[PDB]
């Protein structure tokens, strides 16, 4: 994997109308993967490696958590949101990869963590260090058991 | 002074839509992370994050399941993103240079 760098000219002509994003590191990123539980998530290790690599190459300092219970996820997401580093970074990233249902994801113990509770950890009241800073979340998890059969193309 | 809503400046990418399953390949991994890594590595230099998630939506829409003799053969998925961002989000990778 390689990440093509932007040009100085692209920066100069776009930074005024964008979130400030120049800190080194650009932010902390957290990649939390659950694979063993809700069948084993084969290929889940490829996703995890790929994102760790991606986010480092994008200039993030990456923290990783693997195979955590719902309660561990909540406690550790809370610890991550409260890190002091957030005051001197310009952005934040959280990727959660697991099984899930609509609005929640599973811990390895088969219990559920609500996504609203996650987003709340990082909001303007609970995480003042990230106020006005862009916060990205990528959630790889089912939102239901319905398989989409697809439709023809008319 | 200016105050803030309780929650703002977030963007959330979802692998699939409300009510539906997200798809994962046993060797290549998840369709959504595979697409996101391709797009970001390649377009972060010149495209904002919300626009890169649109590109990822394009890739996900055209993919289909390969799993003969199961309910997943030729199945589909659609990714989405939700945004409370208030500006362009450009990651400016590798600027300034070393």
């Amino acid at each position: 994997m390689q990440v093509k760098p932007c040009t100085p000219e692209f920066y100069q002509t776009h930074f005024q109308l964008a979130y400030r994003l120049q800190s080194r590191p650009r932010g902390l990123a957290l990649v939390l993967s659950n694979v063993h539980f809700l069948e084993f998530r084969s290929g889940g290790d490829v996703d995890h490696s790929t994102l760790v690599t991606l986010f480092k190459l994008l200039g993030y300092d990456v923290h990783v958590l693997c195979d955590q219970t719902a309660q561990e996820m909540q406690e550790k997401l809370q610890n991550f949101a409260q890190l002091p580093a957030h005051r001197v970074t310009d952005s934040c990233i959280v990727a959660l990869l697991s099984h899930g249902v609509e609005g929640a994801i599973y811990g390895v113990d088969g219990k559920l963590l609500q996504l609203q509770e996650v987003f709340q950890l990082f909001d303007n009241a609970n995480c003042p260090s990230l106020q006005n800073k862009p916060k990205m979340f990528f959630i790889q998890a089912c939102r239901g058991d319905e398989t989409d059969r697809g439709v023809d193309q008319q | 002074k200016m105050r803030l809503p309780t929650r703002s400046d977030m963007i959330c990418g979802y692998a699939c839509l409300k009510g539906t399953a997200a798809m994962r390949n046993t060797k290549r991994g998840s369709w959504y992370i595979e697409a996101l890594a391709q797009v970001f590595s390649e377009r972060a230099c010149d495209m904002h994050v919300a626009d890169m998630l649109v590109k990822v939506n394009a890739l996900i829409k055209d993919r289909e399941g390969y799993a003969p003799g199961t309910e997943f053969h030729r199945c589909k998925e659609m990714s989405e993103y939700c945004s409370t961002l208030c500006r362009h989000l450009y990651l400016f990778p590798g600027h300034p240079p070393t």
Binding site: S42, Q140, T147 | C16, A21, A22, M23, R24, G65
Partner: peptide, 4 residues
């Protein structure tokens, strides 16, 4: 391919 399988489901998450």
């Amino acid at each position: 391919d399988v489901a998450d």
